Every structure is written in C-alpha cells, then in structure tokens.
Nucleic acid binder design. Structure first.
Lengths: 212, 46, 147, 46
RNA sequence: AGGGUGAAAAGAACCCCCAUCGGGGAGUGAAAUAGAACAUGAAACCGUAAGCUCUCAAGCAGUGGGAGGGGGAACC
RNA sequence: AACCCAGAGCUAGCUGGUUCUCCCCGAAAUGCGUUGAGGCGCAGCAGUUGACUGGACAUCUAGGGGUAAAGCACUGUUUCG
RNA sequence: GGCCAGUGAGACGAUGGGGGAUAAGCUUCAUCGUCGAGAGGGAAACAGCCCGGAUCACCAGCUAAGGCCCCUAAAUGACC
RNA sequence: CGGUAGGGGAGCGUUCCGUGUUAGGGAGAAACGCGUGCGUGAGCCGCGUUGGACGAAGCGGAAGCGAGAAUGUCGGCUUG
RNA sequence: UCGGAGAGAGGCUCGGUGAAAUAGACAUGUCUGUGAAGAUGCGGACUACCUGCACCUGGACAGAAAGACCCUAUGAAGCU
RNA sequence: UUCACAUCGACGGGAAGGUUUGGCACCUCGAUGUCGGCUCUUCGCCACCUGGGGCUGUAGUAUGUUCCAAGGGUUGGGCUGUUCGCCCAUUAAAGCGGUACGUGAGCUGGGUUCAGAACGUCGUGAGACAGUUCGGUCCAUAUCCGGUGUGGGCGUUAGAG
RNA sequence: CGCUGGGUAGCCAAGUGCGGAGCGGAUAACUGCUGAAAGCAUCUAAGUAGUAAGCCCACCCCAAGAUGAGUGCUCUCCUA
C-alpha cells in the first residue's frame, strides 16, 4: 500500500542548487524520457486489491512483445518500456485510459520517498558486505580480511542459518524515505530533488509521496 | 580437506553426465556456424 | 484364502460437511480424521487412500473448553536461533482461522508420504458457505455425544 | 541440587506402566459355556 | 616382473579410407567377433540397447503386503 | 653408539588375525598362593565316560546360635529434681 | 573317579550393611533376580524394571505384563 | 530342543592316490546360468555357448584341504 | 585508529595434458529425547522440489602418524 | 531515636543452578591439540544502563530496595602471558554467564608439557624442582551435512509476456 | 610504471543525503471501576478502564518449488 499514486522518473546526475539565502545544498535531477500514463486500474471486486498501473519510456513496437502491445493497446495508450503499478488505498478515481498525470502534486507534498534499483557490486566479500573487521595485518598474523570464525563446537553442530557469509551486494531495489522535493522547473520537466538517490544516472526511479 | 568416503556410481554418473552434456549444448552452436558457413553472404571467415 | 486389497478407487469419494460453529476442537478433529483415513469402510487399508474428502465451514467459531482460548499457543520456529514464535489461539482465530483446524487434523492423521497426500482431503473455510457442490456433500456423521 | 536423579533401570522402576488400581489388577477373563465337542473333520469313507 | 596364435605362418596377395597408425571387404585356415598389446576367460571397474519406474521428498536402503505396467501365454 | 650379512623364523606372560553344515550339552567373572594381581596353579561352575548310590520339590518336627526388635542387670555415656 | 575345557576387574536391580557427606550410573562384602550367554510384547526411543522363555510351518484361536479418542489393535463403555 | 567361552556326535566339499591305459568323452571335459528340481545345511543332480580336451560314480587313503576381517599381502581397477 | 584504490601471479571461464592423500557401503536434514551417559543412521515434532557452480570452514568425536603426556611390562637402551 | 521486617539481618533451617574448587572414573590413548588474545557468532538471566511500578526512615534532586522487562546497549588505555586483578580519563552504564573454560581442517604462539644453557635449592652422583630465567619451523588443492550467493531441468496440465 | 608533482570517470571515506514513525491491537508488573461469595470488605469470581524500549501488525527488502505451486489482461495456433 502507498499513501498516494506516484510517478517514475530517471536519475540524471547531481549538482548543487545555491539557495538564495546563500546556503549550499546538493540535489539530484529527475527526468522523464516519456510521460507517465495510467494503463490499468484494478478494483476490489474484479481483482483482489486496488492499484493503478502506470507506464514509462515509450518505445517502438518492435522492441516489445505481442502480449505487451496487446495489453497496452486494449487501454488505448502509446507503447511504453517500463510498467509498474502503485497499490493505492482503495480509493481509486482514475480512468485507466491515458490519464497523463503531472507534478502538480509533489510540490505540495514536500517530502517524497523513491524506489530505485541500486548499483551492483558483484560478489563482495565479508569485510565489505556486512561491515566486518579484519585481523592484524602484521604481528605474524596470517588471516587478514578473512571471514574469521563461523560457529561454536560440537553442540550447534553446524552454522546457524542467516550467517553473514560473503556474496552479491547490490542490484536489488531500495527505498529512500522522507526525502524532500525542491524547486522544480516545468518547462524542462525536470525535478531538483535534494539528497542522493539510488543509481548511476540513467536507471528507472519510482517516486511516490511518503508513508509517514 | 580429505574426502571421507568414495561416492557411489549413482552420483558420479550424474556429474559425468553433466560434464558431457555441458559438451552437448556447445555443439548445436558449432552446427549453426556450419549451417551458416555453407556459402552465403557474411563478413567472417575470409 | 487371501485378504482383499484396496484395488483402485479414484473419485466419487463422499464429500462431507461440518459446520464447526461451537464444536469443541479436539473431539471434532478426531471424528474428522477418522473419515479422512477410511476407518469407516470394510474396504479399509492403511497403505491405500480409501478415505473421503470433507469440508469444514465456519472455521472461525470452533470452541475450546477451559481457558484454552488464551492459553493454547501455536509455535512456528524459524530454523535460525531466536526464531521461536509464541502465538496464542486467540490471535490465530482472529488472524488466520483455518490454520487452527489445519493443525488439529494434521496431527491426528498419519504423517508420512501417504498422510501428507491425504491431508489435501480436508477443505477448510472461514465463511459460512463452501464453494464445493462436488458430490453434493452429505453432512458428516458424528458418533460423539460430547461436542 | 542435593537431590539425585533417576537413571537407566532406576528410571524404569519409577516410570514403567503399572496397573495401580486394585480393581483392574483383580479381574479375570470371560469363561464361556463349555461348548460341547465337535465332530471329526476328515473321512476316507467318501 | 614379464609363459601358452595355429596341426602347418598357410601371419593376411589385391582393393578402398589412407600422415603406411588403425580399419572394412577379398584370400588362407575347421575356426581369425584363432590376426599377431592373438589360446578358456571369472570379479571388481567403463559403456551401450531394450522392459518397468524416481523431481513435496526422510532412507544401513532390505523385508512382509502389492497398486500400475511390461514378458514368452500359473510362475519370473 | 653406524650400515650390511649371519646366530635368527631371537624373545614377547603384549596387540591384531583363526576360513565349510548341521545336532546335543553348555559355564564363570569367587576363594587361595604368587616380584602376583589388565598372567598362572589348585579348588568352585561345563562336557563326556564308569561305578555306588540315593534324592530333588512340598509338609512337619527337633538342635545350637544372639541378629531385628526390645532393656538398663553389665560396661560407657545421659539429662531433671 | 578317568579323559579334558573355558573362567579368573562383571553390571545393575531388591534387601542388610562398611567407606563417602545414610552424594554419585561410586566403592566394598553377604543372600536372590535379569543382562552377561535371551530373543519377543509393555516401558515413545532405551542390556541390567514387569510378564515370558524362542525346534519349524500356519493370510487359525485364548490369555499374561500393559491397555481401548487419532496417529497404532481394541468401549470417545457403564454407574459413584 | 535359546545360548557366547567351551565339550561331544553326525556330515559336505576341493586337489591327489588304490580299484583303471576304468564307465563316459571331438554328437563334445570345466568356468556361467533355467529348473524355489533336491537336501536341515555345507552342497548335488540335471541345463546351455564361441572355444574343447579329459575324466566321473561307488567302496577306501592322504592332505600346502574350506577366508570379508591380521593399519595382512601380490595384481587389476576405481572415488576425489 | 578505520579502512580504501591500484599493478602483477594465482583464483574464475574456455582449448590441451592430467595427479594426490582418504575411502565398509552411504538413498548422508534441524531441534530435542535417548543411548558406552556430546547420533543423518533410534523416538517425537518440525523443515526441505532435483541437481549444478563460486565462496566460507561449525560438524562427519574430519586426514596425518597402533600417542610423544600418564600408567603397565619381573620390556630395550644411556648415564651415575 | 521508640519501631523485628525503609534498610542490615546474628543463631539455625529448606531449596534450585551447574559455570569455580573438587569426588567417581563411564566413553575417547591405531591419538577428543591446552591457557590468553584476534575475527565472528548466538543463546540464558536471577537487570549493570536504558521502558514502566510498588514500598521508602521518598519534601524536591539524588537514592535504597524489590516487581514485569533480554528489544537494545554493555568504551579507550597503562601494568601482567595471565576476563571484576587494578590505577588513569570519560561514560547512561561501562553486567554475569553458556556455547568441548565457543571459535587453531579460521589466525598469533606471549605461557605451559621437547631437545641448548644458567641461578637458588635437593641429590655424593647421574640428574631434579605443579621455582625462576634467555632461545625454541603449530601441517591442509572440501567428498558429505551446514551456511552465503547464483543458476539449470522439471512441476505449475495446452504453451507463453 | 625509474623517482617525483597533478588529475576526469570508476570504486571509496575521514564527504555528503536520509532513517528509525500519527504508529494501532492485545498484554506482564501495577493502579483501577462496578461487585458478591461472606446481610461490611476485596481490581475478580461475572463484566469492563488505563498502561512497558517487551509481543503482533505497521516500516523496509525477498517471496506462489506457498508442490496448499494463487491472482488477470493480454497473446498463440483447431490443417493433419
């Protein structure tokens, strides 16, 4: 569930916005390759919950399968690469046909929480995934940076599960909460959103008001 | 570091089969390269 | 000569129904799992699944005597340490009701490959209507004076 | 502490099934009517 | 440590694949699926083909009961 | 306190090993002595064979003992007047 | 008596005791039981507790110790 | 008619010898298997193959005589 | 403190050659309980599709050497 | 101050724990690798600190004690090989434990149980002291269960996004 | 890469941004409200109120191999 419907943009680098007061604040910059359009709305009766399915990044028909283009076509909308729905407190008042929305809204809700696929760091070790420590680098020591011990002796008789081994670190989406919006420019349809948001510039970036 | 006990014939056949089969998948690729190298427009194999 | 052996029985197994509105949990679950096994059939055989589907309805209103309703706790333990999950019967019957009976019979009947296979023969529903009219389920016989 | 525990063999005498209600100890099986005898079961006479 | 083609080398003319390694015919021999790392050829171990079968499983893995199916038409 | 060969298959009351079928009977882990007590000798308890036997089990009656319990005559302690 | 063995630190349970701390699945002796050398059923599993003693076959029956709601046989049987 | 240590009784089997240059045997001696044939059992009769040369039974005799246990041992093979 | 980035050789994947110690057979779960008294092999409950590859090493009283500490042997040897 | 129980509780008694020192010696001598640190756990409470409460010889601020509470937290150093053995500076506090005195097929080897040597002492002597002192190569390319990641087949009963 | 200065991207931090919430429901200790057993009283026996970093939902990330394998809006072909 989320508080309200949200949009999804794209990370576009960062910069600073000199506040006229003369204080320096970092910002990132959110952009829309193609505009968010509703492409579905599901009720509590016809389906199990309530949500609106928005889409992003319009693309050529080739790039996209037949089940997709049929799904998009049924609602009478343009193509679109990315496609996600916001489950919404069951108050939906949306015609699933191309209610192109906008940021007439986030400037009022001056705190926004976004969902971004972080960047991916391969198969990282113990010392960095889980913030372990490391043995002495000198003094005859011979186990630096290694995961060290695992468990106890005969009784536990194995390694408690959920142990903090090494493994793959990044690549899964993450929120970031109560991150406040900041002076926006509708001619360029760009957002100047303070803070630092998941992902190197150019990944999809859900964007929806808080759930305080 | 040292194995306890020899594996069965059962298990070993399983893994050898995975080895060979891993060779199976990498033929039909070469067969595509063949069935394409039979004279045709292409920029490869001077 | 030779005792008869359960020879192939597929479907047309009797569907029964039990409205569990205030029927104490244990005793009911014994007479459910005795029709789940087939010990009411001269065709009884432990190794084959001669049983009969049944349907519990009103799975929210099973009664339990004594002070159970706040004492009995269902605990599911995660494999890792600290995973033990104290959980009292009132919280389940409030939260997910069908799991109650889904435990009761699941302890009654013989775990194994076969027991696991049969446990599907219990369909539990928290509403007051059951979507099965499969064999037009004839209500379930209770030989228990105390329920 | 200060109390010992009851182990194998010792544990058994405390905790084996005893039929400790004078009544059921007493009882005896049904007897029957004497069932007057039964014929032969085989005959060459044919 | 390393023995035993055949009774007689009659130890393989000729042909084809052919870097002359090794083979398939042809030929010899009673027989060469006896052909020269050749006489009977067991077991471990390596394959192949056919018959039935395993992916919600729990087991010193067999045993008593035997569902279903395949075999020559009650036994495996 | 070399190495090879020989006495030498040294010795080991110590460890390990001791393969085909069936049938009948079938123990002990106690005492004694032992430079002896994770050995051995004798007894004690198996097998099998030959004598002489008389029982074994239950019942009852005799005979001596100082144990359980009791007692303060004995010995030793023991409180109140 | 003859010809010949093996055995020589047993264990627990019950009892009467010593040692111990009327502690030990401790130790040490006396009288019995089971295991040792003995299966089977009850005891959830479980030498040393209970019934009981295994020549074999039987897709026959009656019981002992123990038991009769389900998993497993057998009354969710009577009355206080 | 349970049975370990152990004692006694009755047997099978293998290589070789006496009866033999035996009976039988290039229409074919042994290793592999179909026969729950047969035995209380060790094992025995039959039954088959590319090869293929010897050799039973009975009454007897002798033993380099019966194996999964020795961190045995010689050879061939695996697991990783 | 408090780590971090980098280059090289390994690791990793593909082509070629190709060992090892270990190994009763393993169809090789967790918790508790039991048990020669610290079990994947027994009991109850939970949990878990089959099978790969990389990575760590808590168990399999993991491998290695019939312990080198302790004791025994009417053992061996050295020194006084 | 009076007042047994705000607080301490003499004299004696009844328990639970299992971690100290021990008693037995049951498994393990064809081997179950010890103390202390490093890294990483996880669990218990009878609670040190944070959450709530009684009673107080609680005016308030501090407390003292008990009650429910393990969700969390539970420093940096100097000395010693040496977990309340300890002074320094803080800090909300700077807990006690179990996990083969957790963890050596993960690490160091400062100590102890190796061969050298010396001091005190015992022994006439070889040598010796659960006295001291200086030096003294702690081996490993995971078969299986376990765990962290990630795949493939196959199940999902037409096939797929 | 000889040794040095300087450095974009990347990866890092001693840099920067944010985060531990109106939360809501049951509770333990405790304080209660009405009130007899017991013609007073008592938080309790009937019934109800408040209330803890503790429990559950909420928060954030996976998740239908959840074999109980869910859901729906699109596709894909009935010529043998």
């Amino acid at each position: 569930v989320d508080a309200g419907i949200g949009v999804m943009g794209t990370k576009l680098g960062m910069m600073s916005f000199f506040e006229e007061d003369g204080t320096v604040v970092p910002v990132t910059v959110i952009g829309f390759k193609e505009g968010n359009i509703v492409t579905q709305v599901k009720t509590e009766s016809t389906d199990g919950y309530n949500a609106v399915q928005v889409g992003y990044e319009r693309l050529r028909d080739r790039k996209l399968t037949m089940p997709e283009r049929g799904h998009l076509n049924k609602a009478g909308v343009i193509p679109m690469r990315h496609l996600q729905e916001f489950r919404l407190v069951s108050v939906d008042d949306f015609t699933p046909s191309q209610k192109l929305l906008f940021e007439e809204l986030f400037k009022e809700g001056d705190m926004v929480d976004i969902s971004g696929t972080t960047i991916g760091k391969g198969f990282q070790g113990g010392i960095k995934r889980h913030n372990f420590k490391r043995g002495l680098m000198t003094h005859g020591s011979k186990s630096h940076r290694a995961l060290g011990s695992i468990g106890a002796g005969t009784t536990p008789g194995h390694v408690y599960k959920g142990k903090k081994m090494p493994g793959r670190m990044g690549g899964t989406k993450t929120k970031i909460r109560k991150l406040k919006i900041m002076k926006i420019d509708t001619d360029l349809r760009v957002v100047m959103i303070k803070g630092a948001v998941p992902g190197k510039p150019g990944n999809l970036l859900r964007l929806a008001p808080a759930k305080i | 570091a040292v194995p306890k006990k020899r594996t069965s014939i059962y298990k070993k056949r399983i893994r050898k089969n995975i080895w060979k089969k891993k060779g199976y998948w990498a033929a039909l690729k070469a067969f595509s390269l063949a069935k394409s190298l039979s004279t045709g427009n292409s920029k490869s194999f001077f | 000569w030779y005792p008869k052996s359960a020879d192939h029985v597929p479907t047309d197994k009797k569907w029964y129904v039990v409205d569990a509105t205030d029927l104490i949990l244990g005793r009911m679950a014994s007479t459910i799992a005795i029709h789940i096994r087939g010990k009411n059939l001269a065709s009884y055989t432990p190794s084959v699944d001669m049983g009969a589907f049944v349907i519990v309805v009103n799975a929210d209103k099973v009664a339990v005597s004594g002070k159970k309703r706040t004492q009995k706790l269902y605990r599911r333990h995660s494999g890792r340490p600290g995973g033990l999950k104290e959980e009292t019967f009132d919280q389940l019957q409030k939260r997910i009701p069908e799991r109650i009976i889904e435990h009761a019979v699941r302890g009654m009947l013989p775990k194994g490959r076969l027991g696991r296979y049969l446990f599907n023969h219990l369909k539990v529903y928290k509403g007051a209507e059951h979507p099965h009219q499969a064999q037009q389920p004839i209500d379930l016989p209770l030989r228990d004076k105390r329920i | 502490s200060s109390r010992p525990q009851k182990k194998g063999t010792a544990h058994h005498m405390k905790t084996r099934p005893k039929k400790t209600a004078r009544w059921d100890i007493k009882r005896g099986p049904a007897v029957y009517p004497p069932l007057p005898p039964l014929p032969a079961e085989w005959t060459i006479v044919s």
